[PDB]
Design a protein around this ligand. Structure first.
Ligand SMILES: *[C@H]1O[C@H](CO)[C@@H](O[C@@H]2O[C@H](CO)[C@@H](O[C@@H]3O[C@H](CO[C@H]4O[C@H](CO[C@H]5O[C@H](CO)[C@@H](O)[C@H](O)[C@@H]5O[C@H]5O[C@H](CO)[C@@H](O)[C@H](O)[C@@H]5O)[C@@H](O)[C@H](O[C@H]5O[C@H](CO)[C@@H](O)[C@H](O)[C@@H]5O)[C@@H]4O)[C@@H](O)[C@H](O[C@H]4O[C@H](CO)[C@@H](O)[C@H](O)[C@@H]4O[C@H]4O[C@H](CO)[C@@H](O)[C@H](O)[C@@H]4O)[C@@H]3O)[C@H](O)[C@H]2NC(C)=O)[C@H](O)[C@H]1NC(C)=O
Ligand SMILES: *[C@@H]1O[C@H](CO)[C@@H](O[C@@H]2O[C@H](CO)[C@@H](O)[C@H](O)[C@H]2NC(C)=O)[C@H](O)[C@H]1NC(C)=O
Ligand SMILES: *[C@@H]1O[C@H](CO)[C@@H](O[C@@H]2O[C@H](CO)[C@@H](O)[C@H](O)[C@H]2NC(C)=O)[C@H](O)[C@H]1NC(C)=O
Ligand SMILES: *[C@@H]1O[C@H](CO)[C@@H](O[C@H]2O[C@H](CO)[C@@H](O)[C@H](O)[C@H]2NC(C)=O)[C@H](O)[C@H]1NC(C)=O
Ligand SMILES: *[C@@H]1O[C@H](CO)[C@@H](O)[C@H](O)[C@H]1NC(C)=O
Ligand SMILES: [Zn+2]
Lengths: 291, 150, 108, 269, 75
């Protein structure tokens, strides 16, 4: 959990790269088509491959971290694994190389859902994690990156479930504009006019670019951004310009948030199908910039 | 009898592209499909539950289309029962409305005493429904008996 | 042979709601009880005031043998849980809009 | 002699010239009018390519049209029920009911297959109109729990520049919505989550159904069209009238009787 | 200014925000209506697909009854 967190470098601006994959439990294809990767013509997406890769990529470099959110997809994949794999993965979670973000069976909507139904849904996901990974696989923050607006009750519900924070992508465009100008991207949300504080006080953070990589740093198999090339004798060399770009990109973003810390959501809808395209380049990225 | 399948489908529908109705037509069809298939194991569970709680011997049945005035049992049987379950933590005095044939029905409550009834007609469709008050205990149920007079 | 049933010995007071009654396991039920009124909705009948309830015998269908407090999603033991703090510039009692979750071992 | 239906707690009147609900009362009298109107869905204009769709709601006209200015009523007064059937159109009709000892008036609406043959996407609404001064404020429930106050064209958090007067004033209503002049309250309970808002004062409205023939460019890639069995839908709306100080307890308790309703199972014998 | 980039999770980023011991402003209202740009509001799905919306809120009432009965009986 928190006792597993990485080493921040005080008195410097810190950019937390958060690799992830927004897997819609149905949208343009069905749940089984998304899990298995059927009819990739409609949409290229197969979650069973995404989970396999992530794990490999995690065993490939102990520094790497990954957060997965939709329990309905994970739950399935899991029963599909061998005792060997399950023993391994449990260790990745134990030492926090694999972390769970929302914990719900799915990432529910906030405008048309019934508070009671939202709970059954959450309890169901958190239930699986609970008895599969114990305390070690319990989410600490809530992860609504795509819902279209947010209800005060949702915040109340998460607060009452023991979540410390809640991050999201979609908010009114005018609201966002003002928030970045007023350095108010993050604050505390009092979601109840009944419950006594801190009971319904959920910390809230408005992400930078919705939930997608900064323009030019998308390395999934679905993007076509130029990959990192270090060979100094090679014409495709872009390692230098790359770092020049990043640094400017980071200090620009820092100015929008109150602490020496900012997130960078590295991933989008159904990415990491081939987890390695992402991690290989990210590894170099972290090394070249901290260098 | 399994409540797991329905609890799971209700979770799925909680997605942000499901109940919000923001998914494609086929995904919207498969969503309803997962729900339909969760309703069966549950009424199986509900049958065993009741049989156990009331001892009643008859095979129960469910009327999923009350929604549009359709229920084979209440529009064909001459003698049948109505088990009304109440999930609220207090008593309910709720109105029952079942589709019947063009006859007169007599309604008896849990005790056996004749309770007020009334066959109402559905305008323009010229089909009708049997009506009566059903007093149900909190977290409980009541079983009324019905018979079409000759 | 059993025309009418009820699961309670004494019904819930109007300001309370049986949120969840469920089978958590073999001899374990999941129970949630919320206070359906928010501060101000007293409507002249002190319906928004706190309420205290006894859980021993509330239910007749079964008997509660063990009880254990929980967080809303039932994945942590409320007494063993905690959240980060933030500076901004039996008998269970319920306050307006409070939902309490319990895992109780039972016997039928 | 006007068209009337009653029971112990309430009495509803219908306008002789129209067949529409004209007056509701507690045996608090309240002149309320109800009717179905539709919004001519937008496919875009010089102001923006945007079009109404599965996600987005954009009327190319801020003023809805009457699905019909009057309704053909058929009185049915039974020993156990009192209902006024209303026929507004081939794809729109409603039944207004009052059952034994029930504190609310039941409005069961059926918005049949919306005619899109005119080539115009439509978004239907049931709108209640009254004179009770609400000052642009109205209330909505958040996922069926606490209630948040809403103001026409206003934002608690910033200084809003309204771009759509109708659209930017719609909020999710999952169980209820209400408008009070501080003295008497009119509340509406739903059987499913819907959209709604108080566009003109003393008025209210929920969205029953919508059918658009043009995608709204957000991902789905298909117009909320061809829903099949869903083309034809039927739902209920529970109208509640009481003084502001007594309203709360009633909508809370009935709202719960609405979601955790009784289940019926039959057995032959 | 200096920059340090690293792998991280939303939870660790939150731990650092806490460690800073700051004082944050308070939010007391919902985030509706959502609008990603002028003339376009995501307020139409509040009613999109009435049938399904009702089918689900009904399955809820049903699952509940199902749950309560499984609890009262002791198989
Ligand atoms: C009042 O209240 C109502 C709620 O109570 C409310 O909602 C309606 O509720 C009713 C029930 O209460 C709902 O009815 C059920 O609906 C289910 C869903 O039906 C739709 O989806 C089916 C499957 O769709 C997939 O597969 C099709 C082919 O197989 C494709 O054509 C689809 O495109 C879709 O494909 C996708 O998914 C596939 C995986 O599933 C995937 O491989 C593929 O690639 C792709 O991704 C369809 O079959 C079904 O179509 C039928 O009906 C339409 C009408 O629109 C016709 O055009 C079709 O020709 C066809 O007849 C729909 O698209 C149903 O599955 C469910 O059926 C079962 O139950 C009913 C009774 O409840 C039985 O009569 C029936 O026999 C079924 O039982 C079968 O299955 C069971 C277990 O499920 C089994 O035990 C038994 O043997 C049997 O085989 C039922 O009909 C209804 O959906 C709700 N409507 C809405 C709009 O939500 C209603 O609105 C309210 N009324 C008012 C107010 O007006
Ligand atoms: C409401 O009244 C209308 C009359 O316009 C009914 O619709 C007509 O019904 C007749 C016979 O049922 C059809 O031949 C017409 O074509 C219908 N009108 C149309 C579609 O143009 C309608 O059935 C009534 N609705 C009710 C009371 O449910
Ligand atoms: C209210 O919204 C409108 C549109 O978003 C703003 O006016 C537009 O501003 C752009 C450039 O900023 C112009 O090119 C358009 O011509 C304007 N639209 C029209 C037709 O007037 C407006 O600025 C907003 N309100 C304010 C002043 O903040
Ligand atoms: C509803 O919208 C339609 C579509 O804009 C209005 O008619 C329009 O569509 C016609 C073809 O379908 C165009 O040829 C017309 O130019 C256009 N009308 C206008 C705005 O000039 C229609 O009038 C609207 N319906 C009502 C009665 O409000
Ligand atoms: C893990 O796999 C082994 C086969 O090697 C199996 O016997 C064992 O039961 C599995 N885990 C369990 C259920 O203990
Ligand atoms: Zn999504």
């Amino acid at each position: 959990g928190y006792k597993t967190c990485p080493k921040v470098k005080p008195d410097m601006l810190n950019v937390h790269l958060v690799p992830h994959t927004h897997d819609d439990v149905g949208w343009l294809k069905t749940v089984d088509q998304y899990f298995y990767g059927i009819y990739n013509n409609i949409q290229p997406a197969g979650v069973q491959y995404i989970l396999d890769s992530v794990i490999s990529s995690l065993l490939a470099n102990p520094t790497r971290r990954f957060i997965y959110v939709e329990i309905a997809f994970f739950s399935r994949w899991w029963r599909q694994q061998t005792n060997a794999t399950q023993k391994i993965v449990r260790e990745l979670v134990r030492q926090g190389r694999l972390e769970f973000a929302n914990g719900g069976w799915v990432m529910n909507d906030e405008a048309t859902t019934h508070y009671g139904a939202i709970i059954d849904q959450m309890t169901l996901g958190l239930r699986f994690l609970e008895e599969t990974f114990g305390s070690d696989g319990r989410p600490r923050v809530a992860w609504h990156i795509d819902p279209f607006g947010h209800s005060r009750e949702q915040a109340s519900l998460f607060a009452q479930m023991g979540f410390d924070g809640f991050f999201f992508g979609r908010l009114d465009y005018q609201d966002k504009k003002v928030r970045k100008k007023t350095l108010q991207m993050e604050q505390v949300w009092r979601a109840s006019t009944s419950l006594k504080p801190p009971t319904a006080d959920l910390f809230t953070s408005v992400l930078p670019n919705m939930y997608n990589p900064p323009e030019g740093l998308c390395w999934d198999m679905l993007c076509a951004d130029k990959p990192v090339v270090e060979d100094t004798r090679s014409p495709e060399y872009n390692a230098k310009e790359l770092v020049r770009y990043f640094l400017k990109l980071a200090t620009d973003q820092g100015k929008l948030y109150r602490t020496k810390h900012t997130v960078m959501t590295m991933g989008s809808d159904f990415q990491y199908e081939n987890a390695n395209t992402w991690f290989k380049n990210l590894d170099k990225l972290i090394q070249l910039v901290n260098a | 009898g399994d409540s797991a399948p329905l609890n799971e489908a209700m979770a799925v529908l909680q997605h942000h592209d499901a109940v919000s109705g923001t998914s494609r037509q086929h995904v919207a069809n498969d969503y309803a499909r997962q729900l339909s298939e969760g309703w069966r194991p549950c009424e199986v569970l509900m049958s065993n539950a009741l049989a156990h709680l009331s001892g009643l011997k008859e095979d129960f049945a469910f009327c999923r289309k009350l929604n549009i005035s359709i229920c084979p049992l209440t529009q064909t049987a001459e003698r049948f029962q109505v088990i009304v379950y109440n999930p609220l933590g207090r008593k309910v005095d709720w109105m029952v409305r079942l589709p019947v044939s063009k006859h007169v029905y007599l309604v008896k409550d849990p005790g056996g005493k004749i309770v007020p009834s009334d066959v109402v007609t559905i305008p323009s469709s010229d089909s009708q429904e049997l009506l009566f008050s059903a007093l149900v205990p909190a977290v409980g149920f009541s079983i009324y008996s019905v018979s079409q007079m000759p | 042979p059993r025309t009418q049933f009820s699961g309670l010995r004494r019904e819930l007071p109007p300001s309370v709601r049986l949120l969840t009654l469920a089978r958590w396991g073999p001899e374990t039920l999941l129970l949630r009880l919320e206070h359906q009124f928010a501060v101000g909705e007293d409507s002249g009948r002190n319906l928004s005031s706190p309420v205290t309830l006894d859980l021993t015998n509330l239910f007749s269908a079964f008997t509660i043998t063990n009880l254990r407090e929980t967080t809303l999603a039932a994945n942590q033991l409320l007494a063993y849980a905690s959240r980060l703090q933030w500076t901004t510039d039996a008998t269970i009692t319920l306050q307006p809009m409070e939902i309490r979750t319990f895992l109780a071992s039972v016997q039928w | 002699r006007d068209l009337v239906i009653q029971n112990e707690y309430l009495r509803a009147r219908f306008d002789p010239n129209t067949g529409l609900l004209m007056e509701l009362e507690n045996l608090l009298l309240l002149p309320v009018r109800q009717a179905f109107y539709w919004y001519n869905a937008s496919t875009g204009n010089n102001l923006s390519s945007q079009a109404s769709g599965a996600y987005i709601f954009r009327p190319n006209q801020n003023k809805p049209l009457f699905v019909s200015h009057w309704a053909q009523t058929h009185l049915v007064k039974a020993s156990l029920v009192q209902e006024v059937h209303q026929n507004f159109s081939a794809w729109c009709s409603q039944v207004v009911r009052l059952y034994p000892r029930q504190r609310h008036l039941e409005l069961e609406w059926t918005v049949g297959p919306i005619p899109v043959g005119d080539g115009w996407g439509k978004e239907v609404i049931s709108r209640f109109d009254t004179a009770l001064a609400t000052r642009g404020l109205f209330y909505t429930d958040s996922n069926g729990r606490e209630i948040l106050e809403r103001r026409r064209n206003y934002r608690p958090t910033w200084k809003l520049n309204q771009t759509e007067p109708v659209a930017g004033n719609y909020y999710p209503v999952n169980s209820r919505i209400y408008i009070t002049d501080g003295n008497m309250q009119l509340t509406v309970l739903t059987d499913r989550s819907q959209g709604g808002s108080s566009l003109r004062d003393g008025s209210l409205e929920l969205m029953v159904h919508r059918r658009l023939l043009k995608d709204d460019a957000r991902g789905v890639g298909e117009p909320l069209n061809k829903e099949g069995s869903g083309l034809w839908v039927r739902g209920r709306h529970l109208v509640l009238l009481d003084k502001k100080e007594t309203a709360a307890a009633r909508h809370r308790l009935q709202a719960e009787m609405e979601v955790l309703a009784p289940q019926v199972v039959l057995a032959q014998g | 200014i200096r920059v340090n980039v690293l792998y991280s999770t939303p939870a660790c980023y939150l731990w650092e925000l806490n460690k800073a011991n700051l004082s944050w402003s308070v939010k007391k209202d919902d985030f509706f209506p959502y609008a990603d740009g002028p003339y376009m509001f995501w307020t139409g799905y509040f009613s999109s697909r009435p049938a399904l919306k009702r089918y689900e809120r009904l399955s809820y009432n049903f699952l509940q009854v199902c749950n309560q009965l499984e609890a009262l009986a002791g198989p």
